[PDB]
A paper describes a structure:
The most prominent mutations are in the spike protein, which mediates entry of the virus into cells by engaging with the angiotensin converting enzyme 2 ([name]) receptor. Despite being phylogenetically distinct, a common feature of both the UK and South African variants is the mutation of residue 501 in the RBD from Asn to Tyr ([name]). X-ray crystallography and cryo-electron microscopy (cryo-EM) structural studies have identified N501 as a key residue in the spike protein at the interface between RBD and [name] that is involved in critical contacts with several [name] residues. Mutations that emerge in the receptor binding domain (RBD) of the spike protein are especially of interest given their high potential to alter the kinetics and strength of the interaction of the virus with target cells.
The [name] receptor is bound to the “up” position of the RBD. We present a 2.9-Å resolution cryo-electron microscopy (cryo-EM) structure of the complex between the [name] receptor and [name] spike protein ectodomains that shows Y501 inserted into a cavity at the binding interface near Y41 of [name]. [name] binding has been observed only to RBDs in the up position, likely because of steric constraints in accommodating [name] in the down conformation. However, the stoichiometry of [name] binding to the trimeric spike can be variable. Negative stain experiments show that populations of spike proteins with 1, 2, or 3 [name] receptors bound are obtained, and consistent with the binding studies, we find that a higher number of [name] receptors bind [name] spikes as compared to unmutated spikes when the incubation is carried out under similar conditions. To investigate whether the [name] mutation increases the binding strength of the [name]-[name]-2 spike to [name], we measured the binding parameters between [name] and either unmutated or [name] spike protein ectodomain trimers via biolayer interferometry (BLI). This revealed that the [name] mutation confers a modest increase in affinity for [name], mainly driven by a reduction in the dissociation rate constant (koff). Our structural studies establish the molecular basis underpinning the observed increase in [name] binding efficiency conferred by the [name] mutation.
Numbering used by the authors:
A (entry chain A): 348 to 595
B (entry chain D): 19 to 614
The structure:
């Protein structure tokens, strides 16, 4: 999308791999302002909002908290308390046209600054004087949207950069977007420290003859100790025998 | 609600639309110049007419915002260049007549031939033709024949056209509130609205004369030495006391005396500084030339060139059918698009010209953050002197031993520096009297001090007074001899080459004072000193956003044009010429002694 009409995509109920995005070397700019990639792998968030637009290379620095400029005032305002990531890469091989790609617009004139994450696709004629516009173009009445040129022979700083901004947030709601869980291999018949779906402990994990019902995951004895469990990777039942400590 | 915010919105809109249309126009001009095709000529004409119509419409719209109520000086600088009506203040038929006169003078200048009277069988144009016979030939009669033939043909074909061009340009400048068209030409050096740093446009004709009265002894000694040496090749044609004939000056017009060096060399038995044999024995290429020049620029601390410069420039003749205009031109298309169009071969002259054009490109890069009206030189001399800084610095033996090109045991004795300073004198201080003479003559013609029936009489006397050159045969007003030059016949201001030749020695002196060079100025190298590059880049990045007096004072500490760095550059040469001219007639009186 163009930056005056930036696309916003709501992301929820899924597992997100930010490590492929960070490890991709094609991104010319990867700035995160309240998180880390390991933190992104270890923080669960309720909502992820993907804002996508095309700007120039010079306009990439304006996508930040506390910045000022034609994009940051009149097109896309980021709040000062932003917790998210800004990802930018050069798109000269796709967006640029040899005759000029005039299809990517941006808002040059507006009466007031934007509130954070506001969008305004209105084509209202900017009245810069006391003389009324009455819709028509005049000597002080300008059309607010202007076209980027985006030719492939432009220098860096005028070349088209696709920018995706991810906004993460925690609300008074159950959080569901959370990073890739790295499960290791399963080792049986040894006293190991097990961590099964957030249930941790120490024990010997052996094969079990207890046939669980499909909705049940863990097993408890009379004394409310976890002695049976289901492996989440392969649906098999394992007994947890305590490690064989004794008196000497 | 105020004039400031309306003017700023108008300037933002004009900057964006003008950058777009100027990039289209410059791309069309580039596509025409690197590849002559009639479709490319039509595209270039269409883009130029679109930019001209757009600039005329925004000049019409810019008159509604008055300059008297604007307090911001940058808005004043951006709006004075828009509110100038230019040639559109005239009627449509007069503007059409002036444009038709300009195009027909350009076409008749371009299409001149050197075909002999009573021998019309074959001839060439000026560039393969007249340049060789006037620059390289040692004969008197064929040089005189070619000179008289070309001046006669251009004089009869352009004397009405140039007279009407003078009348229409005078009416244009008097309609545009200037005194004359020379006063319009001096509006590039005008500074107003700044206290202390202001510079009247009538002060330029005082400063140029004030600097030429201290140039003139050195030029008198150089002219005396050239006149004494040129009698060896022309024994009976040149008098020992009188002035030089016009056609022997190593050029068509005597603008550059640089081809007279082989006739006037002081010490021919010394080895030369010509590195072309070692440059072709090391198997250099144009990419190697530009890479070593870019290494020279990054040694000074200026940023290196973009990948678009390397992937888009035309550094070699493209091929068989892709003809190109082989003149060296640096292109700033805007929006980060810098490129060089220059046909190259392995030559020290092409090496120095590559340094010159990359100096122009670096100066275009430095003010790229400025708005569109202010992306130009501080005056018309700055943009050509910034390349000549690189041309002076890249010719030094210290730089030619830094890149390993010159032999390391080449000894910089007295003679091998005197015969280099003489070549630099014939290139640089040889063009100052011709430039000042021609622009003084044009200012008196456009002012109206010279009537039409006294143009040539006043010109040759002025040539006798200033340049010290007599005519080969007496001419009258049937000819128009100065208009045969490229710049005057195509409406180009030509005093840009005078201030360039002074500013290049001021900046280099400042940048040799910054680089802590202990030795002489002609042996100074700008390289390897980042503190000189910061001093230069603090001025190159301003553009037209600041007065040229302040941008000059930021470098040299003086807010006016000055001539002392040029004099103390040539000080060993000046002492050698003063010790050489013990018995020769130094200087001249105006005379017809060599020929009546
Ligand atoms: C999970 O992946 C394992 C890997 O072997 C596969 O066998 C199994 O079918 C998948 N699904 C479930 C529900 O376990
Ligand atoms: C130069 O112009 C000719 C004329 O048609 C064309 O065939 C050729 O492709 C052009 N070359 C370039 C590099 O544009
Ligand atoms: C002109 O206005 C701009 C923006 O308002 C400001 O940054 C600049 O300093 C002003 N220039 C002068 C000379 O007041
Ligand atoms: C310009 O110099 C920088 C600094 O080392 C370098 O990273 C960059 O690759 C250079 N650009 C080119 C085109 O060589
Ligand atoms: C600049 O410094 C480099 C690094 O020491 C050196 O190789 C080069 O010769 C120097 N150039 C000059 C002109 O001193």
């Amino acid at each position: 999308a163009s930056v005056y009409a930036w696309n916003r995509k709501r992301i929820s109920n899924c597992v997100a791999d930010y490590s492929v995005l960070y490890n991709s070397a094609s991104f010319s700019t990867f700035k995160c302002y309240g998180v880390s990639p390991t933190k992104l792998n270890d923080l669960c968030f309720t909502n992820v909002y993907a804002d996508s637009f095309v700007i120039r290379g010079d306009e990439v620095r304006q996508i930040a908290p506390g910045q000022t400029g034609k994009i940051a005032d009149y097109n896309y305002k980021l709040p000062d308390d932003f917790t998210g990531c800004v990802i930018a890469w050069n798109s000269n091989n796709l967006d640029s046209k040899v005759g000029g790609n005039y299809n990517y617009l941006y808002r040059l004139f507006r009466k007031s600054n934007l509130k954070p994450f506001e969008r305004d696709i209105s084509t209202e004629i900017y009245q810069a004087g006391s003389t009324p516009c009455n819709g028509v173009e005049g000597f002080n009445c300008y059309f607010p949207l202007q076209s980027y040129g985006f030719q492939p022979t432009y220098g860096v700083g005028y070349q088209p950069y696709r920018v995706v901004v991810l906004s993460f947030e925690l609300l008074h709601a159950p959080a569901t977007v959370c990073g890739p869980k790295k499960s290791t291999n399963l080792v049986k018949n040894k006293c190991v420290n097990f961590n099964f779906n957030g249930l941790t402990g120490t024990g010997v994990l052996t094969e079990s003859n207890k046939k669980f019902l499909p909705f049940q995951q863990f097993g408890r004895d009379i004394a409310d100790t976890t002695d049976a469990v289901r492996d989440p990777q392969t649906l098999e039942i394992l007994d947890i025998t305590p490690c064989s400590f004794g008196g000497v | 609600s105020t004039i400031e915010e309306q003017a700023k919105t108008f300037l933002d809109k004009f900057n964006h639309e003008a950058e777009d249309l100027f990039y289209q126009s410059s791309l069309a001009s580039w596509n025409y110049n690197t590849n002559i095709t009639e479709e490319n000529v039509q595209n270039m004409n269409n883009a130029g007419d679109k930019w001209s119509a757009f600039l005329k419409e925004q000049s019409t719209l810019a008159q509604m915002y008055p300059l008297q109520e604007i307090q911001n000086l940058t808005v004043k600088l951006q709006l004075q260049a828009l509110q100038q009506n230019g040639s559109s203040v005239l009627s449509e038929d007069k503007s059409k007549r002036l444009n038709t006169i300009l195009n027909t003078m350009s076409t008749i200048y371009s299409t001149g031939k050197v075909c002999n009277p009573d021998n019309p069988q074959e001839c060439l144009l000026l560039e393969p033709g007249l340049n060789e016979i006037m620059a390289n030939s040692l004969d008197y009669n064929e040089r005189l024949w070619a000179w008289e033939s070309w001046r006669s043909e251009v004089g009869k074909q352009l004397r009405p056209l140039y007279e009407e061009y003078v009348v229409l340009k005078n009416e244009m400048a008097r309609a545009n509130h200037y005194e004359d068209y020379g006063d319009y030409w001096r509006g590039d050096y005008e500074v107003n609205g700044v206290d202390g740093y202001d510079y009247s446009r009538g002060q330029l004709i005082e400063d140029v004369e004030h600097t030429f009265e201290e140039i003139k002894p050195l030029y008198e000694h150089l002219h005396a030495y050239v006149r004494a040496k040129l009698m060896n090749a022309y024994p009976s044609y040149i008098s020992p006391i009188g002035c030089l004939p016009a056609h022997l000056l190593g050029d068509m017009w005597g603008r550059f005396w640089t081809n007279l060096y082989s006739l006037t060399v002081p010490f021919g038995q010394k080895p030369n500084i010509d590195v072309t044999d070692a440059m072709v024995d090391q198997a250099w290429d144009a990419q190697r030339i530009f890479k070593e020049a870019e290494k020279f620029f990054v040694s000074v601390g200026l940023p290196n060139m973009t990948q678009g410069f390397w992937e888009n420039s035309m550094l070699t003749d493209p091929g068989n059918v892709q003809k190109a205009v082989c003149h060296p031109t640096a292109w700033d298309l805007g929006k980060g698009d810098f490129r060089i169009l220059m046909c190259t071969k392995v030559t020290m002259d092409d090496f120095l010209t590559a340094h010159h054009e990359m100096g122009h490109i670096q100066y275009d890069m430095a003010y790229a953050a400025q708005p569109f009206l202010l992306r130009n030189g501080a005056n018309e001399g700055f943009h050509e002197a910034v390349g000549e800084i690189m041309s002076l610095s890249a010719a030094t033996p210290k730089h030619l031993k830094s890149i390993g090109l010159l032999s390391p045991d080449f000894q910089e004795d007295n003679e091998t520096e005197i015969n280099f300073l003489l070549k630099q004198a014939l290139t640089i201080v040889g063009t100052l009297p011709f430039t000042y003479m021609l622009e003084k003559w044009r200012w008196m013609v456009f002012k109206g001090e010279i009537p039409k029936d006294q143009w040539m009489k006043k010109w040759w006397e002025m040539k006798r007074e200033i340049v010290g050159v007599v005519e080969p045969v007496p001419h009258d007003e049937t000819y128009c001899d100065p208009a045969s030059l490229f710049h005057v016949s195509n409406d180009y201001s030509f005093i840009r080459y005078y201030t360039r030749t002074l500013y290049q020695f001021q900046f280099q002196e400042a940048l040799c004072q910054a680089a802590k060079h202990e030795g002489p100025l002609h042996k100074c190298d700008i390289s390897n000193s980042t503190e000189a590059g910061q001093k230069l880049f603090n001025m190159l990045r301003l553009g037209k956003s600041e007065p040229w007096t302040l941008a000059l004072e930021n470098v040299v500490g003086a807010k006016n044009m000055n001539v002392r760095p040029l004099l103390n550059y040539f000080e060993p040469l000046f002492t050698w010429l003063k010790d050489q001219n013990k018995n020769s007639f130094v200087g001249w009186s105006t005379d017809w002694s060599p020929y009546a």
